[model samples]
Target: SPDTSVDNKVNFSTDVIYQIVTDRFADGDRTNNPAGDAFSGDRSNLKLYFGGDWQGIIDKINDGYLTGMGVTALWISQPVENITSVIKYSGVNNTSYHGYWARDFKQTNDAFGDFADFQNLIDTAHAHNIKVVIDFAPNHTSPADRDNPGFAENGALYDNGSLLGAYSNDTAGLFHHNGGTDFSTIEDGIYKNLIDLADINHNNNAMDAYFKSAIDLWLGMGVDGIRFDAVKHMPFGWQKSFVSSIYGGDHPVFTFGEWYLGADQTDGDNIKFANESGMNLLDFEYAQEVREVFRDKTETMKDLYEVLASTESQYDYINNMVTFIDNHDMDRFQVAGSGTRATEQALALTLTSRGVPAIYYGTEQYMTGDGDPNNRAMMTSFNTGTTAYKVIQALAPLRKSNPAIAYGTTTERWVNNDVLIIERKFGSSAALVAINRNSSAAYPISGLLSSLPAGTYSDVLNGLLNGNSITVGSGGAVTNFTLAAGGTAVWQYTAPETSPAIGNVGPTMGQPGNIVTIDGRGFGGTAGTVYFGTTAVTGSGIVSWEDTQIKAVIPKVAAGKTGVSVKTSSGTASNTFKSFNVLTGDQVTMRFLVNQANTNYGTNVYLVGNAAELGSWDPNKAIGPMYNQVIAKYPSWYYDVSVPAGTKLDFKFIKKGGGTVTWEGGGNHTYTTPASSVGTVTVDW
Candidate 1:
């Protein structure tokens, strides 16, 4: 188990992911299929169950279907027990074939498989060197009609078999009754129901404890990572507390959430959530750009390159964000027949780009559909002969063989409307990619500079996407050439990493007693002193130290953002991984509202307090320019924060701007945070 060569799920920078919609992947076991007319054996009804189960996934893994294409990880549909309600709409019955309408978080979906089938799937995947990531939606339960008690089992939630509560008679307030969200503000979305779905009340203590136990059960089942669905529909502060509990446990896995972004859309809230929420996010910005440039043809390569540059500056853990061209929610990257080259180019870019890349199943086979159920058709084919499949086969392996492609910094070498040249480099390795989007005209590619050692390098595609080889001159100058229209090429060089570098730090935020996993290269065989912002941890605090991985316990230190660096046994210092936030203690989501906290022009209110988590009363390090347009209007601004649970906190609001700060003119307001769930404190200024 001490083998330094073995990789763990705490970091996935060097892995290529295959996203599988379980019901659409395969139907290896018919006995597990839903009985009593929930099936469409002929595939006539798109929404009905197709019988794809865990055994089918297990079969593909054992047959090398995924491994042959260099997929190192698989993100499968949720495995929980979903509602069996066959709701009729427009004279057609729909079932829970998608696995999103959860009825019981603690049990397995019968349509998918039983516990034994799931264990076999996990074991078969691991045996083939594939890590498994399950999709989880904790925001809500099954869709329900409040007026109809028997509709969809009343959107009931279960703990194995015991009824926690249901929608119709939720006297315990396990679910929200605030009607459906109008998709207006952040608070509106979090507090209200989503369509007909019963939104789980995270502010309820029983519901909170139920989710905590459910997560523990899954982690104990050996799930490597988690992909939380519809994270924006949940309260930000409560999500942080949930994430904190995961890291606080023995199984601190890689966790990320879905925060959807539309075309040309950028939300600061989304950025802040990924940075401060102790979880990574789906790279929706990157996905939108890829579709714009390659699918819709609405944006230029320059815009895509600019996004690639800006994201590096925007995200603290950019490498952890999952990148994709298309998924179930979006139209397939390929349309009916026109996007062969564009799809191939987009695939090449994502697979070699700066983040974890995921391939939607059947994208390689050129699956064509518009949206939702249409884009989510059954796996049409497994043909390995397609050029798109070949493209994936060529580029996906680089995430493993080439560290530069995984954790490297991206640099734009050349760019134009239809063509772009990009390079990625780590310590001693480098990878170069060039794409020509023009379908009918070749582009002259010159003025490109890279860090690759001088040599003649052939296209990794080997003409799979109509690519060619190139020679590198001295000083990393690239030889001049005209890239053929619709051409995409990749060339890379890999070097063994001997220098100390911390590529990733998982469970990046936690309290003093929590364990954090640090992964990268050259940690060395001997124990190393890991530093959390100059508070060196040695001896027992250092749990395990290997050449590429280290597990260390967070020491008692000041809370807030701290840099993580490794000092090997030889006293050699490594690169510091940034933004490891230390918490004062376990957390609770608290809404701090101050009415009539009016300010002058260009000034805004911010919260500061005595606790380390609240900047230790330092006004300069306050929490926010609090919200005005959402929830509370101007002069009554409020912010939701994750504060140490059960602690009495003295806090004051300050007006910050115009080179000065004005403090509230009275004694500090004080309140004790709830030990569980959320609390709202209203103070008058």
Candidate 2:
């Protein structure tokens, strides 16, 4: 039987998410609408508010629009208080209708709803098995000018009704004074404004503490998850520290960040952020490839498979990545000339592929737009008869019923220019999917193999979108057949697991002292030895144990990527949940520099230290092959690192080539990080 005890908020791998723009989704309270010039009753000016509120979401949840479509989670727009600034952008009046220009994070938007209404929305969503994740952008406040306090709300921040500060006069050091970024480097983006919005000064201890407390308030209010906006614009180390507090706290929930990538673009920094930063990320790579293959037709099925393969190997937690075709900032999946079949094919891929699937609002209704303002149009229709709606209604629920669809390994079983057959298998459960992108021609599917046992399987869509049945012979091989044009079919086999297999580990990143939850099956009712790397925690370390879950405190161990596993009292070892980061302690983002640490070409320098955050002096797990270009010149290296705050750190720099090693002839160099602020350490050979 499927594990019905699982909660969507803890492990989103089993849920289908619906993204909502609160101002455009639905309207149940006209009283909450912003009045005067900020209000556009007819939505003629898309930049202005049209009055959608929490009551509207509750109505839809109660009326079965979301539940009927198998949506188990909702990623709503930020509900924080925003500036009612009617700023003119190119002569068109613009308001903070999208909730990105946050003014006060502790209070409600008021335009969305009151606290009671917000609570009701959360309660209603949970009652229907739907999790709620709100957009959180602590990176900046409203748009502002440093010299002009009279402009709009002047990017003013408020604590309820009390004035904190504004961009023009930040005596409290609340916002960054740096000019706009040119988007040339990660450091430039993190430290400077994106155009005119006031960038938050995270180095300010006051601001950091305030935002940390603010997020705790939301957690207390019973939010299930958080979707951080503009993650690329924040310091990666600061973000690591921020999420450390969340995942380490008493009320940890699923968290992910929005770090976008364009078409055919890949960045190692983005991958490292997802792997090491204590939070998962929205899969822009998967999104862009899906768009390229199905919508634009610029890339073939082979290219899509290549992306899948690359991501599978690169990301430590592939199932945690949030997958979607298009989001608010990009063009919708269905542009003016994009085919309806293309949209359906894309939707099928996202729903069945690995990771949590998020569908944009109105996508089920086949809403069309090319870009912003147009892309975020009003809900438009509630008719449940659309083919796309049926398509979602068909494939989305499979995630809940099959383990393979939820947390399985993806493999390309068959591929060609126009046809791709993919297989997902986890233990005994399996799901097979085939997509033929060629809209006008049928292709022969030859020699496709799957892990599913021999049997006849019907398409999960049952002829919707021209899907058909498939027959498989013995040895997990399929009989050769043909797939129709624009064909999409899903065949799945579900079985209860009897082996000790781990599906998820909550708070995927944490310090050694935090308690993390492990969810899986076949774990004995009694205690088991939980492994953080090779270090085992048993006895009192195992806080609680059941057949499907275990709660254990992380042992004081070396910090870095750790492989987590469970060996039951019965001596059955479960699979490892790869790459859990063990933070050292209280964190501060700092840059470490070394001068005259010269090395030959193709040789690299690495930093190692005594603290757990620095791999505990293990050369096999050092900080890096340190960067020598960009921020620092050659022969002098620098690394932006997050380590314990205010601690005595003993470190050394070593040069390593493939077969040669050289160390500085000295005792360990020492540095003391500031108790709270970001600092730099400059050392010499």
Candidate 3:
């Protein structure tokens, strides 16, 4: 193990990660599921199982997507083999995609790939300098009567599927024989039969050795960590020994327990139990509380901060929590006033605060739906092109660049209205993340705060200076300030460059999803495209403006600029405007919205695929948000709109088809059609 001395104290903070459900990604091996509720080496079913394998994730790493989002590691779904059984469910039938049901520990899910394939994927990620985490479910075993060496399904009862028989080898008497009660009946509150899983006798040496061996095998495969499943349900002593032998002893392992307690004595005690048991505990307490304060209603940041600070302990490893906006088991975090940016700020406070952070799979792309299967859809929605992806990409590096954010504690500089201004730091790295709770205040960080080193810091979110700073008094107290809407600032120890870099200077800019690159003289070697307009521009040395300049290909004209409209990212100062025309030498980028508008398709949108149309798109000069905004702006260019069959006008996936129309309901990718688009539905968005 690397010596972690005081000087070598690399902060294990600011690791805002991404959690992936492997079954939802691409299936490298179609020969995995030959039948229902089984991994028999064949193509998986579309509804029950999605073939999201390790290879698909490896591809994302190879494509620079992971590093782009500041994701240090990935907490993939349980990679171990699952129970092979005839699982018959009522209503809409579905199978295992979340991977909570386990069949065997010695084997890997052929649904994902082979053991060699799994290790290869891990190695590939390491080569790219990323961390890999696997799931460890020691609490429950498969219900199927199969050859399981020695372990418990529930309450210390071992039903090892060996032909030896379905007998209880629980000599330790740690659990009940016939009645299914957990090791921690006090914590789980009520004891019930979970999958009729035969609980293992923790006192049994052979059973303990078997669990340790499984973990050792996974660790040997080069996994960076483990996410222990249903941890609180297990006995404290068993968990303690397991953690000590697997990691607490010498394995540089980081583990977290799914105790399922939210922001109370129950949650805190479980997290404490994790620390005492040689692993980290998720801050479910804070997660549940914050959701109540911000998600259901407009609450104050002060209330949220109080909960966070209250949970903070001077001696405890508070940063060990796996803070998440939303996970596979919960509601998605998008679909708000644009998927509740304020709630995102509140949730981001947990991630950005003193702890480990985790962004659920489809979070960036604003993926939201009603329930489980919907929340766990494929991650194809958050791919290469999207503002959300870019935002995540921008935020990830800030975490890596600033360790103080993860390790340093907080001190309020100011707290009023709904704004919570605080500082976080550890050693040389430090920053101030301010959250403005005002629903309509467009500029939240225009004048944030003080009480620190006198210098400049970058607003990594919007790429501006002191945009979130307050006038510093003696000893760094705040005086006056102006802030942006829901704005945050990452004030570093060193003074950031006051003036814009020469390469950064030029025409306006645009985003990768809607690029408007400027080609002129003086583009730097490290120049990351030009934003001659409103959005962002990418590509190295792409902005070269010379006497005879050549305009880079403009991807989307809406985000482009003529020397007229006020260009912000481009640093376009004092320009006389005229017409929205693309100069011959100016770059003209085409625009392609991923979540296309069905009603606005022909009227305001274009260039969509079948999937986009099938998913969510509206075109018909309809009364949708974006279309209404566009109509409010340009009342003339927008003519009477009409939607054709299979038209995605506003990315709502609407259709006026043969006889009747159908659409994918909720987020499950399940097809169901409402009577009318404007009809009162049973559920709300």
Best by lDDT: 1
* Prediction-by-prediction clash tally: 1, 0, 108
lDDT of each: 0.87, 0.86, 0.49
Model 3, 532-643: lDDT tens per residue? 4453444432423321122233434342123322222345432222222232121111112123224423333222122211222333322111112221222212111111
Report residue 380 deviation for candidate 1 (angstroms): 0.6
Question: What is the per-residue lDDT of model 2 for residues 1-685, given as tens digits with 9 covering 90 to 100?
Answer: 1333425356788888999999999998988989999999877998999888899999999988878898888999998999987999899999999999988988999999989999999899888878899999999999999888888888988877678889997988888887899998776787789999999887677677778888999888888899999898886767887777777777778889999899989999899888888789999999999988988889999999999999998888898899999888888888775678888989998999998899999988778887689889999988888889899999988887788888889999989888889999888899999999998899888788889889999999998988889899999889988899999999999987777888888778888778887876778878879999999998799878877678889999877778999998988899999878787776877678999987888888988888866768777767777767545687898776778888899998888878376777779999998776767789887
Weakest 10 consecutive residues of candidate 2 by summed lDDT: 1-10
Among these predicted structures, which one has the highest TM-score? 1
Kindly give the stretch of ten consecutive residues in candidate 3 with the minimal lDDT sum: 1-10
> For residue 98, what is the lDDT in candidate 1?
90
Worst 10 residues of 1 by lDDT: 1-10
Candidate 3: misplaced stretches above 4 Å? 1-11, 33-47, 91-94, 144-178, 181-192, 248-250, 263-268, 336-340, 442-451, 463-474, 477-479, 494-685
